[PDB]
Amino acid sequence: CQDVVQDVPNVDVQMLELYDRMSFKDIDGGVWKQGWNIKYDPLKYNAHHKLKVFVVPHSHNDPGWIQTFEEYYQHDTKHILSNALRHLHDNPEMKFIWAEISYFARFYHDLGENKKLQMKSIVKNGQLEFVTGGWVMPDEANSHWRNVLLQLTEGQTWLKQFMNVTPTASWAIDPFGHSPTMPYILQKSGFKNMLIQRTHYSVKKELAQQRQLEFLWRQIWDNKGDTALFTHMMPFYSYDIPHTCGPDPKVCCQFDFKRMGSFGLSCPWKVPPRTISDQNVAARSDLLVDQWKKKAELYRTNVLLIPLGDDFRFKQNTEWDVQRVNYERLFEHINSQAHFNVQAQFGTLQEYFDAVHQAERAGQAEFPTLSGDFFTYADRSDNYWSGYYTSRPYHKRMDRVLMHYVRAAEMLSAWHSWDGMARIEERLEQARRELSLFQHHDGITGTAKTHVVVDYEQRMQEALKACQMVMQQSVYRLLTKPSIYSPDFSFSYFTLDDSRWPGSGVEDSRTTIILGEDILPSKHVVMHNTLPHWREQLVDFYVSSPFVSVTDLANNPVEAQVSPVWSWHHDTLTKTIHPQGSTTKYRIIFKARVPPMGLATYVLTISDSKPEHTSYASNLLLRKNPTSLPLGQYPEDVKFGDPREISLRVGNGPTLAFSEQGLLKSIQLTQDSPHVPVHFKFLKYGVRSHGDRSGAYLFLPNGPASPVELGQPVVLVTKGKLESSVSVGLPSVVHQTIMRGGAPEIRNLVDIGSLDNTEIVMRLETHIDSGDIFYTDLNGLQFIKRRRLDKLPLQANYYPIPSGMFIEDANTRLTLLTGQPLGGSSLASGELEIMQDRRLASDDERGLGQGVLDNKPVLHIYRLVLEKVNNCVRPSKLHPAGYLTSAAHKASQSLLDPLDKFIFAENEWIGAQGQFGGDHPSAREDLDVSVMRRLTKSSAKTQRVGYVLHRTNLMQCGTPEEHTQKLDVCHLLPNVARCERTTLTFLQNLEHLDGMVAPEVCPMETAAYVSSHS
Ligand SMILES: CS[C@H]1[C@H](O)[C@H](O)[C@H](O)[C@@H]1NCc1ccccc1
Ligand SMILES: *[C@@H]1O[C@H](CO)[C@@H](O)[C@H](O)[C@H]1NC(C)=O
Ligand SMILES: [Zn+2]
């Protein structure tokens, strides 16, 4: 295994180093506004060395943006595909590339058989070529790598099954900035090439000057280069026709033949295209070839890529004709005039890359190596696209909930083969497809119109219901005596109980377990642990009595704590935000211990008085002018006091101190250690009163944030043996700090209400001597070093925080893990900040045509880990990566993949069993079974199960922590007959494994294996 910590890779271009050296000046470069006047030597190409030009027709089809997926499909995409089929069928030399499989599958299944056969023929002959082949073209900033892989697999599995092709070239022309997680996943999925477009205009200029727009993109920790994927970065401001033929859009726009008038389009530069004729073809070719030769100067080979397309293009038959006939006249002239020394033709993306690599092998070019990312993108001036790291945060959080539910449903149901009548495959396909659709670069990014966001939310809600159905049928089958099991595949044997989604104060969706002497004495509950190691975690349920005790199925008592059910209310009469307690529902909390990828059953039983093994939390309300807070049968009366500082400690864990406003002020790790200043603060950013305004994409603050005026907020302190907390009702946020013995959990119920033109930020202030350095993650996969640059505006220093961020000095580190992707930064030494929500009345002029005014309450969740790191073996100062400690990685897993909780629905569960998975191996902590998916239906004689195994890399800090079992996923199911290593999409077998044993992977690697069973 390669060492991912101690060896700094030697690359030609390292993006953090490039950023440190670049000046980012925005000067007027002439017709190429953000470049320079390109010059070329006319003698460079001659009869023995011609410029080969591939014009690649395309149509960018968003699966939701200004219209819903179905609306665009009916109004636009179905016509584009039907006419592409007809025009390619009838014109053998015409070509077209297609990226979004969600639309293609929707179209293909509606075609008659004669047309399905015509479509398969134009794909098999190479006229229509799929690029990437994912369900969507995903966002690369907020997406979790597990969902990027999920959507890639959904689209490619469909293509292999119906079109018999697997793309090896990727096309990503619209995500707003680009992540190295893409080449990481693509290279492990059989790809050989990829293309990107939205990178900072200063980066395009810098790389163009050095002819470094094509590069071998490797991961930041990869010393050897085996993760490298050839990447082509487009050079210009857009992928539309005016910015793809060459540097001068006023000239290129004249070669978009849809802009002469009858289609309702025109050229902003005021010179229209003209139909090509024998009288103008020489002057028109002179102009076009000059643009091509200028573009070719920015690259190293004699093969030039010329995309020809725009959003929802190629819809009308007349549009196909006008583009094709005019380009054919140009090619016939250009290719016959030896003096141009050009051979131009329609082509596909793969044809371009194959020709580039033929040139490379002929020794005509060598390509530079590059590591790093391409965030934060700016398309012009100071317009940095960091707003969408936070826009529509409710749905960003929903993405992570559904991510976990899909994994848990696929894993729980993979253990058995299911009859078709159980509809398991049907429900899982629906859930995977709705989550995959939301990875679109207008889905999770929060950049779609309001009604489109509602469509994505409804789709995801249906997907969550599908996952619940599959999970609960699976639990019932895994935990019921086989000869007793009698399933009704439409019945709900269990209901899921989720304490954090939609969350307290967001939706009263949780069921109360109703017990009573005259109705039901007890209830079975079951916990599932999708992680491959034994895990303990506190779990809570709502119950109708405070006198409840817990037992495991061997009837051993389990220690429990009962606390009240507190809800917060914005009291419009008293104008205060304060909590109300229930007098008939209570929370019971206990530690569940669950096997690796397993299930554990417990029983909750009511008694007439306080149970021996259940304790009760105390509650203290701090506010002036208190009023009584009765709690029914709860045995401890609520206490009251004036606001004051307070301190809490659960177990042997840290001691936390809070201000009189209920906000953390310090953390003391152990009895003797110092009280380290760690202060939470809420602030607000506004919008500019002149110039460009913030919107769904752009963050254009009117200066540094201002503290939110807090008044004298109401603070609620609950102190328990198993769990304590401090909650405060601030304007726009009920902020909670929860302690269970280790790093605290933070929950914010964020309701920005009607605060227009406001972005609310949560900041941590410490005295850690971080300087200008901080770390943020990329797609939940890796942590990358960031350097704050005062030569760039505030919004340029914001980066995606898809799952965590940290600051550190020689001795101390503070890591904030998230349960949802949000934007954040470290704007001063010792600080971390993360945006909670943003409400914007203005549009940011990118085409969305609305502000962001559809905010709704969202429960954001986090873990806050303060640690001593002086003994940790960390990368050197020049390494571009950072790594989590064991505690921080486990805290991230507690947010993203918590235990699942099931409540038995009926009164009695006959044949109930106490555990599943007790014999499953408990794998080393850095290893995860990211995906477990049965790949065959029940009619297959040979069953196949696919696993994606990911190993992260955790810092060595002196903890022996060992004794674990080797995990061989190929032997998790019985009767294994074969084990194969495959691409991550499971679509190609790469190695037949000896002994049917799937080896574990190296740190930072991901592998896939498929086991076959007789
Ligand atoms: C506003 S940017 C982007 C949206 O968020 C959608 O994804 C849409 O495809 C659009 N493309 C880029 C584009 C815009 C205008 C003209 C040509 C291309
Ligand atoms: C699928 O493509 C392969 C490669 O061209 C070809 O050999 C095969 O016949 C095609 N159809 C089948 C058999 O799946
Ligand atoms: Zn788009």
Swiss-Prot record:
Highest taxon above the source species: Eukaryota
EC number: 3.2.1.114
Induction: Inhibited by swainsonine and by copper sulfate.
Keywords annotated in UniProt: Disulfide bond, Glycosidase, Golgi apparatus, Hydrolase, Membrane, Metal-binding, Signal-anchor, Transmembrane, Transmembrane helix, Zinc
Catalyzed reaction equations: N(4)-{beta-D-GlcNAc-(1->2)-alpha-D-Man-(1->3)-[alpha-D-Man-(1->3)-[alpha-D-Man-(1->6)]-alpha-D-Man-(1->6)]-beta-D-Man-(1->4)-beta-D-GlcNAc-(1->4)-beta-D-GlcNAc}-L-asparaginyl-[protein] + 2 H2O = 2 alpha-D-mannopyranose + an N(4)-{beta-D-GlcNAc-(1->2)-alpha-D-Man-(1->3)-[alpha-D-Man-(1->6)]-beta-D-Man-(1->4)-beta-D-GlcNAc-(1->4)-beta-D-GlcNAc}-L-asparaginyl-[protein]
UniProt xrefs under CDD domains: GH38N_AMII_GMII_SfManIII_like (cd10809)
Cofactor field: Zn(2+)
Annotated membrane topology: Single-pass type II membrane protein
Short name of any one Pfam family annotated for the protein: Glyco_hydro_38C
Gene3D superfamilies, per database record: 2.60.40.1360, Glycoside hydrolase 38, N terminal domain, Glycoside hydrolase family 38, central domain, Golgi alpha-mannosidase II, Golgi alpha-mannosidase II, domain 4
Name of the molecule in the record: Alpha-mannosidase 2
Organism expressing this protein natively: Drosophila melanogaster (Fruit fly)
Gene: alpha-Man-IIa
